[PDB]
Enzyme design. Structure first.
Site, mmCIF file in Angstrom:
data_model
loop_
_atom_site.group_PDB
_atom_site.id
_atom_site.type_symbol
_atom_site.label_atom_id
_atom_site.label_comp_id
_atom_site.label_asym_id
_atom_site.label_seq_id
_atom_site.Cartn_x
_atom_site.Cartn_y
_atom_site.Cartn_z
ATOM 1 N N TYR A 163 34.801 -4.390 2.602
ATOM 2 C CA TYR A 163 33.969 -3.944 1.491
ATOM 3 C C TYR A 163 33.368 -5.167 0.808
ATOM 4 C CZ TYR A 163 32.415 -0.751 -2.181
ATOM 5 O OH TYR A 163 31.654 0.008 -3.040
ATOM 6 N N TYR A 245 39.738 6.701 -2.382
ATOM 7 C CA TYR A 245 39.198 5.914 -3.487
ATOM 8 C C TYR A 245 40.242 5.655 -4.568
ATOM 9 C CZ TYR A 245 34.387 6.733 -1.792
ATOM 10 O OH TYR A 245 33.222 6.774 -1.062
#
Ligand code: SAH
Ligand code: ZN
Ligand code: ZN
Ligand code: ZN
Ligand code: ZN
Length: 270
Positions: A163, A245
């Site tokens: 990420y 998440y």
């Protein structure tokens, strides 16, 4: 809004052109669901963090390497003596097994080798560093917007990608979803709206097939580290890539319910 002068065809070809400029295995674009040509055309793909004012980058005076040299880098069978692993508990082992996949017993922290180390770039302990290995495909999902899936089989423990985005401070975050705190070791945050990687399109799932491993290579303050996605289930071709998440990526900075098909979906709001 913007880019109104560009037709459906023109937009799609420019995004596919942007994807071909990415280095490494191919990244493709597909939409069999509706008529949206592509994601935002001003988004920019990067291969490492883009730092902003306020971010104090790592001090190289704290950097430590390892003495191993040998013929082909560090030795998985001799996990002791490699100084990069000293932070680990008594039964020290490299994070990775012989197949190049993260081990089942590995914790949430992966300690990799650095440039200060004496081992070559083919060292077994530089998996995350050598980068993506799977061909990926951005595609339009039924009820979640855009998503990503793999074109090749990915057994559990396979590295996928990192990420990336703009590293910013709390202040910069206030002045300004897509926020991913670097909260593992205890104020920097990752913002992937304008800059990022394919992983910017990974959707959420309450029973995910990939997870985040904090890969550390700097021996200073751990304010900036790699957010490395690894498969935790087996992933068949065309299977959408999803991670949880919760605790990692923010759900919001009148919401939207979660649309993962899991039989244990807890039902978050975005
Ligand atoms: N399981 C899920 N259920 C519902 N919405 C989701 C979702 N996972 C991601 N989203 C949506 O996508 C956002 C996360 S960012 C990436 C979303 C997608 N790649 C796109 O850009 O279209 C969330 O705010 C939410 O609107
Ligand atoms: Zn070593
Ligand atoms: Zn090392
Ligand atoms: Zn090494
Ligand atoms: Zn869910």
């Amino acid at each position: 809004d913007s880019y109104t002068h560009l037709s459906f065809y023109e937009k799609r070809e420019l995004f596919r052109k942007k994807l071909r400029e990415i280095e490494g295995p191919e990244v493709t674009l597909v939409n069999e669901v509706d008529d949206e040509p592509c994601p935002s055309l001003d988004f920019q793909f990067i291969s490492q963090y883009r730092l902003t004012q306020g971010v104090i980058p790592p001090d190289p005076n704290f950097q430590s390497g390892c003495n191993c040299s040998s013929l082909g880098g560090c030795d998985l069978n001799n996990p002791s003596r490699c100084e990069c692993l000293d932070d680990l508990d008594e039964p020290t082992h490299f994070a990775y097994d012989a197949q190049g996949r993260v081990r089942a017993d590995t914790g949430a922290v992966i300690y990799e080798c650095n440039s200060f180390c004496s081992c070559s770039m083919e060292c077994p302990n530089r998996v995350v560093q050598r980068g993506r290995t799977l061909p990926l495909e951005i595609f339009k999902t039924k009820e979640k917007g855009w998503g990503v899936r793999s074109l090749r089989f990915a057994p559990a423990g396979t590295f996928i990608t990192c990420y990336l985005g703009e590293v910013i401070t709390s202040a910069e975050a206030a002045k300004r979803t897509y926020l991913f705190d670097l909260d593992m070791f205890d104020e920097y945050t990752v913002d992937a709206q304008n800059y990022g990687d394919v992983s910017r399109f990974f959707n959420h799932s309450c029973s995910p097939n990939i997870a985040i491993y904090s890969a550390v290579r700097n021996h200073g303050f751990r304010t900036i580290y790699d957010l490395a996605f690894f498969a935790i289930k087996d992933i068949q071709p065309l299977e959408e890539l999803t991670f949880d998440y919760a605790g990692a990526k923010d759900f919001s900075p009148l919401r939207r319910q979660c649309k993962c098909g899991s039989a244990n979906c807890r039902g978050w709001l975005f």
